From Swiss-Prot:
Domain CBM-cenC: 4-152
Segment of the intact protein contained: 562 to 718 of 1077
The protein's name in its UniProt record: Endo-1,4-beta-xylanase Y
Top-level taxon: Bacteria
Family, similarity comment: Belongs to the glycosyl hydrolase 10 (cellulase F) family.
Amino acid sequence: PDAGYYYHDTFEGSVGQWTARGPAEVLLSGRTAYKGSESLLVRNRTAAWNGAQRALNPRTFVPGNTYCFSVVASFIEGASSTTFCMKLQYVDGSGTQRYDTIDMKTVGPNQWVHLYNPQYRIPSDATDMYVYVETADDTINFYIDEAIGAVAGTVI
Ligand SMILES: [Ca+2]
């Protein structure tokens, strides 16, 4: 736990547990950043659902519990505006993969937007969990920074 944070990805010389969702690719970039000098670039998307993801440990993010999730995202080109969605990917009690929305924000180019939900409740039957970031309907390259999973209510 922490200053309440369970995880806090700054992107300074490390990707942390972040990986690509779909056939995309994620890597550190110094072209833009919200804090420090780097951020996580997400590119090679061929469908809007592609993006950046991180597995969530059920020992720490108990299903049925409420938690805080936060991230800042931006893009520079490829669209005139986009809708960033921060989400939870999981498998339910029936063995079916579900996608639940944690937060979503629409923004134009060259502008950091804050994806944030201090009170997100994880469905009680969830297993094999992943928090992910995508855009709703484009395949633009985008950047994320300051990725945080924390205690319900944490002010970010
Ligand atoms: Ca950074």
